[PDB]
Symmetry: D2
Subunit: 88 residues, 4 copies
Amino acid sequence: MALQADFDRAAEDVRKLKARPDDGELKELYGLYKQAIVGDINIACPGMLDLKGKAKWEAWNLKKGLSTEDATSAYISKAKELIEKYGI
Amino acid sequence: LQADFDRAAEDVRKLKARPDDGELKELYGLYKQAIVGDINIACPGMLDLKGKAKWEAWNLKKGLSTEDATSAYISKAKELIEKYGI
Amino acid sequence: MALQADFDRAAEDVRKLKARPDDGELKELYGLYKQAIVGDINIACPGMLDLKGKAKWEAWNLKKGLSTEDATSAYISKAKELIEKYGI
Amino acid sequence: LQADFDRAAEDVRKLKARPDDGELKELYGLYKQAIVGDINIACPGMLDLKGKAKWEAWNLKKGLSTEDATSAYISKAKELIEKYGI
């Protein structure tokens, strides 16, 4: 019950911050809060476990708006970088 | 450029070691953007950045007991209070 | 080019409807419009191909808010229905 | 109720034929709601009903040529105009 009280106080006190925590800090705070109060997520969110598909979308979405030419140019530079690093 | 792209795309198959995950992501993203262009549909949720972030954040803590998660929240909250002030 | 013109006219004329088409009609209209102008969807949207996971979420989400008792009661009636239909 | 649920859940494993998809969905949804309760997280996108509907609608037409999709759009549009009026 000591922990419960300290949790209740921490949760309200973090509302008083004089500056906004960065994204990763807000994620850690949120994750812990839910896990503490709710426990494990209780359903497999479709796709969320599709790590390959998510990675491809994220990777490709990052390049949204790059023209054909600029994406082609960049691919070559990246490929050359990996070839230099690892060898062929 | 086209010829250099075709050669680079084939040559990268010859690598003597597997690039790390971030390296493969950058290569894949550029390859698709080059050959295909913009993704042509809004993938449901994928643009739901708030919802995605919450799921990732919370999924990372899968398996922590109530007590450990409670204890850790308090430490994190106190950590943020020390860092930013109240 | 005859088809293109008829498409352009149909697409603008459907805006003039005196009543809103039902959901399935709007879906068919939208699907055809995109397929005509854009072609195939060009990325696998994570999860969207996870048909098992999507079906479970949809099935369970439909029951959101049912109390334990009412969901338990209903499960039994449903199970009894399937047992009567198919046999055991 | 609990006992009747436990018996029903086991007995439905004994079915002599596989229920259709909608039947399995209803059974599954009720089972989870009974044992687990409400889904405890908003699954990204799943609540994006507009985006989901668009993807489903468009995915259904995967593989139609430009011409066939164009021709069919016109027929559908004319169909809706005849039905609802303009």
